[PDB]
Swiss-Prot record:
Classification via Pfam families: Lys
Xref: PROSITE patterns: GLYCOSYL_HYDROL_F22_1, GLYCOSYL_HYDROL_F22_2
Keywords from the named record: Allergen, Antimicrobial, Bacteriolytic enzyme, Disulfide bond, Glycosidase, Hydrolase, Secreted, Signal
Organism (species): Gallus gallus (Chicken)
Protein name: Lysozyme C
Length: 129
């Protein structure tokens, strides 16, 4: 599923991401924009052989199982395919665990490089929330 901007903001809010660990909703929408362009089916292979999955590009080295990432973990206890669903529940729940892991949203290098410090409220401007 390719979400619309405000559609994704509303789903994220409904699943409890607005101000989760202190990160306003615009941070999450901005991260999803540059990680996946709001596409739940986005996948990208990393140089180390792990793969990133879904709207927030969650990686198989730590967080999900895809059967092909040696030496990896599955800390969210989910098959990585769950992260590609049109239902964002698995991606949200796993993102909550990641953002609690110590480095906040810096875990998402696209968030650090393209969202952090910017006017992220713009990402939810105009939306009925
Ligand atoms: Cl957009
Ligand atoms: Cl915001
Ligand atoms: Cl694996
Ligand atoms: Cl699995
Ligand atoms: Cl959803
Ligand atoms: Cl933080
Ligand atoms: Na894994």
């Amino acid at each position: 599923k390719v979400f619309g901007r405000c559609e994704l903001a509303a789903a994220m809010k409904r699943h409890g991401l607005d101000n989760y660990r202190g990160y306003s909703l615009g941070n999450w929408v901005c991260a999803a924009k540059f990680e996946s362009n709001f596409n739940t089916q986005a996948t990208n292979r990393n140089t180390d052989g792990s793969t990133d999955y879904g709207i927030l590009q969650i990686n198989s080295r730590w967080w999900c199982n895809d059967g092909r990432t040696p030496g990896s973990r599955n800390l969210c206890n989910i098959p990585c395919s769950a992260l590609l669903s049109s239902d964002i529940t698995a991606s949200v729940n796993c993102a909550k665990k990641i953002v609690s892991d110590g480095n906040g949203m810096n875990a998402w290098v696209a968030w650090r490089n393209r969202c952090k410090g910017t006017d992220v409220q713009a990402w939810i401007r105009g939306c009925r929330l």
